[PDB]
Design a binder for this molecule. Structure first.
Ligand SMILES: *[C@@H]1O[C@H](CO)[C@@H](O)[C@H](O)[C@H]1NC(C)=O
Ligand SMILES: *[C@@H]1O[C@H](CO)[C@@H](O)[C@H](O)[C@H]1NC(C)=O
Ligand SMILES: *[C@@H]1O[C@H](CO)[C@@H](O)[C@H](O)[C@H]1NC(C)=O
Lengths: 224, 224, 221
């Protein structure tokens, strides 16, 4: 008898802008016509929690409860409660979840690092790493665009926010993208956008192409 | 007694992120006891309002109503209805606002333009000019940010979007920022963010500095 | 019960060089048998106003008065008056108009951004007209001497300048293909504004406005 609550984080909002919060019911015996509800602080009602899933063939419990909310009732501090009643535990169970205010917010420095000359001199495939350093709290959304056209998410891989070594309560994350290096010899655009809550407009874009940190070599200084 | 619907445009529900619909009435007698009621299509209860304007000099009056809603509720077009009831009206007066759907969407190709070499010869004050072209519908937002932090909202002037010459349904707007010749000749990178309802993260940005017209491989100088 | 005129602007003089006075009536309920009378300050007669107007489509009336007066009395302030004699009024009403600091624009053209000459399909040249007062410059665009069509450029209105107190700015964009602008193509923009001494300024940009003309560096393989 556990009831968990999976909330929507910044990666889940910003990918969709359609905040849906999920109440997970697990650890019972396999009974049908489950009774769950999603309620506010003031006891009202929401969208129905359709798309019930299958149960478990290892005989644990499976029920989800969704509700589509819009964002300001999730940030202002309204607690959202999933209520659970059934045949095993027919007593009213309350699982409350909200957004836990009381944490700082610093802005992510983003550096997009171009592929190293050891990697390119094989001429097989290059990987570009967007480094999203310095920020707090967690839950950043890193995604990649190839000149105003979002790349397929089978291609990049974002890390998880692991806490920074020398910085106190901050984080970092990474996101690598494997370009075929034949596409990097034309060297098009490759911008990395990073959606955090502490930015001014909440979206930062950095870009790197084949000639970005290249210094000037041929300093011709003719004098007369 | 004329009524005016001022629906929040995309500029207004982007720069505050606090969608806030308002409606006004002019040509009204200078008497107290205003009621301006907002409602939905189904008829729930909305936020109240205060801060009613003072008298007109021409023995007339104007009253104002402010509320707050959700953004998906705008994009769903629940035509919110504001009704005037007073001790000087003969009849109920009303307006129904919505989202005017039935429109295309198009991407603003921002281009940031660095000042004319004629103007960095007089040596007082440049004018950097973000050109925001190609979009549809109207109502783009442009904001200038120098080194993360935003510049003062009266050091730059966005125009109003005007229909582009050959392409029919598209528009263009401009925005100019004035710097002096000492701020430009250090470089400062001067970002120009463009907020528009057809961009994937709804915020794009460009940047220029005085080393952008350079060819940055050769530094061909010339001394005397 | 009002009458508003359409006085000549600088764009109304300079585009046509056939300056004219026009005035329309409003808030008057619809009727017929109206007379509008264009009349000078000292009362002498004018060009005979013709081309009678129609009713308003909002249950009211409009009426038009035409005239063609040359520039010396308009630039000095002949307070031109268009009298309405209606049926709503047995009191005929005289509505006068007039032509009421002077700085000069600094036209700078700006050649298209190098981000735009990678698409190779459109380029936008942008005649920035900053500094002037009063409003309503007339900007137009001449290509190789012969003036370009009025459907290949736009121009905003004046909009008051950010830091300057009572001075304006304007803009005008002219769209060319990349094959046009990458083959020479002088593209003069000419501002027409009264506080200029000659009353016209014109400036030019081709592709080669910036290479420094002593040296000429190339990058060969
Ligand atoms: C490039 O040449 C200029 C021309 O005199 C010289 O002053 C400068 O030191 C050189 N820069 C570098 C990085 O070598
Ligand atoms: C580039 O050339 C300028 C021109 O004098 C010179 O002052 C500067 O030091 C040079 N810089 C580099 C990085 O080559
Ligand atoms: C320099 O001049 C030569 C001949 O006039 C020409 O071939 C070359 O293209 C010029 N340089 C550039 C960058 O166009």
């Amino acid at each position: 008898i556990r009831v968990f609550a999976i909330p929507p984080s910044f990666a889940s909002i910003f990918l969709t802008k359609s905040t849906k919060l999920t109440c997970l019911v697990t650890d019972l015996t396999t009974y049908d016509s489950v009774t769950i509800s999603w309620t506010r602080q003031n006891g009202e009602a929401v969208k129905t929690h359709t798309n019930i899933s299958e149960s478990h063939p290892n005989a644990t419990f499976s029920a989800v409860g969704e509700a589509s909310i819009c964002e300001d009732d999730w940030n202002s501090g309204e607690r959202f409660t999933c209520t659970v009643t059934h045949t095993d535990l027919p007593s009213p169970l309350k699982q409350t979840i909200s957004r836990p205010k009381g944490v700082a917010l610093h802005r992510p420095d983003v550096y997009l690092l171009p592929p190293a000359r050891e990697q390119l001199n094989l001429r097989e495939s290059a990987t570009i790493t967007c480094l999203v350093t310095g920020f707090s709290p967690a839950d950043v959304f890193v995604q990649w665009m190839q000149r105003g056209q979002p790349l397929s998410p089978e291609k990049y891989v974002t890390s998880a926010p692991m806490p920074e070594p020398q910085a106190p309560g901050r984080y970092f994350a990474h996101s690598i993208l494997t370009v075929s290096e034949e596409e990097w010899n034309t060297g098009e655009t490759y911008t990395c956008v990073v959606a955090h809550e502490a930015l001014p407009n909440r979206v930062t874009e950095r870009t790197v192409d084949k000639s970005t940190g290249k210094p000037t070599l041929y300093n011709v200084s003719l004098v007369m």
